[PDB]
A paper describes a structure:
MICAL1, identified as a Molecule Interacting with CasL, belongs to the family of MICAL proteins, conserved from insects to humans. MICALs are intracellular proteins that catalyse oxidation–reduction (redox) reactions through their flavoprotein monooxygenase (MO) domain and use F-actin as a substrate. These enzymes bind flavin adenine dinucleotide (FAD)2627 and use the coenzyme nicotinamide adenine dinucleotide phosphate (NADPH) and O2 in redox reactions, causing disassembly of F-actin likely by directly oxidizing specific actin methionines. Active, GTP-bound Rab35 directly interacts with the tail of MICAL1 through a flat three-helix domain revealed by X-ray crystallography.
The interaction with Rab35 required the last 150 residues of MICAL1 (aa 918–1067), in which the last 41 residues are essential. The C-terminal region of MICAL1 has been described as comprising segments of coiled-coils2137, potentially implying oligomerization of this enzyme. We determined a structure of this domain by X-ray crystallography at 3.3 Å resolution. Surprisingly, the structure consists of a curved sheet of three helices, exposing two opposite flat surfaces, which differs from most three helices folds that usually form compact bundles. This structure is formed by anti-parallel intramolecular coiled-coils interactions: while the first part of helix H2 makes coiled-coil interactions with helix H1, the second part of helix H2 interacts with helix H3 also with coiled-coil interactions, and no interactions are formed between the H1 and H3 helices. Biophysical measurements by MALS and SAXS indicated that this domain is a monomer, and thus does not form an elongated dimeric coiled-coil, as previously found for other Rab-effectors4647. Overall, the domain of ∼80 × 30 Å in dimension exposes two large curved surfaces on either side of the helices. The mutant S2 (R1012E, M1015R, L1034K and V1038E) and the single mutant M1015R had very low binding affinity to Rab35 indicating that both H2 and H3 helices participate in Rab35 binding, while the opposite face of the three helical domain defined by the S1 mutations do not participate in Rab35 binding. Most of these residues are conserved among MICAL proteins, consistent with Rab-binding properties of several MICAL family members and with the crystal structure of Rab1 bound to MICAL-cL48. This Rab35-binding surface (oval in Fig. 5c) explains why the Δ41 fragment (aa 918–1026), which lacks the whole H3 helix, is unable to bind Rab35 (see above). Importantly, we reveal that Rab35 activates the enzymatic activity of MICAL1 by displacing the inhibitory intramolecular interaction between the C-terminus of MICAL and its catalytic monooxygenase domain.
Residue numbers in the entry: 925 to 954, 964 to 1016, 1020 to 1059
Write the structure that this text describes.
């Protein structure tokens, strides 16, 4: 048991901030004050990039938890069969449960390399 919904709050924080910045940037697009409205705009984008960067990382961490939940919920299901002489159909179904479990490892094998390939471009 782990209420990791603290990620969700920060998610809505960023969305609002972006939706704002989206708006704030528009009113910004509407000759010494020029050089100021110049710098400010590039300062909006670097915040967006940050926010989007963070946002992606969180969503990856959301998909990860997603598959982690729908992994235990079927680990029990597998344990039902193998934990005598069940109907051969009972064996085909067990077979279909396993092909799905591998489908998740591939997924977790991707999200991990998303995390890894993302921290690598930072260098």
């Amino acid at each position: 048991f782990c209420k990791a919904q603290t990620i969700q709050r920060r998610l809505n924080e960023i969305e609002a901030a972006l939706r704002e910045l989206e708006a704030e940037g528009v009113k910004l697009e509407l000759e010494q004050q020029k050089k100021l409205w110049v710098g400010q705009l590039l300062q909006l984008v670097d915040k967006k990039n940050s926010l989007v960067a963070e946002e992606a990382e969180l969503m990856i961490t959301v998909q990860e938890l997603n598959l982690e939940e729908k992994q235990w919920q079927l680990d029990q299901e597998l344990r039902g069969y193998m934990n005598n002489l069940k109907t051969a159909a009972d064996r085909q179904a067990e077979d279909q449960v396993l092909r799905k479990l591998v489908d998740l490892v591939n997924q977790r094998d991707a999200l991990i390399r998303f995390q890894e390939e993302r921290r690598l471009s930072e260098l």
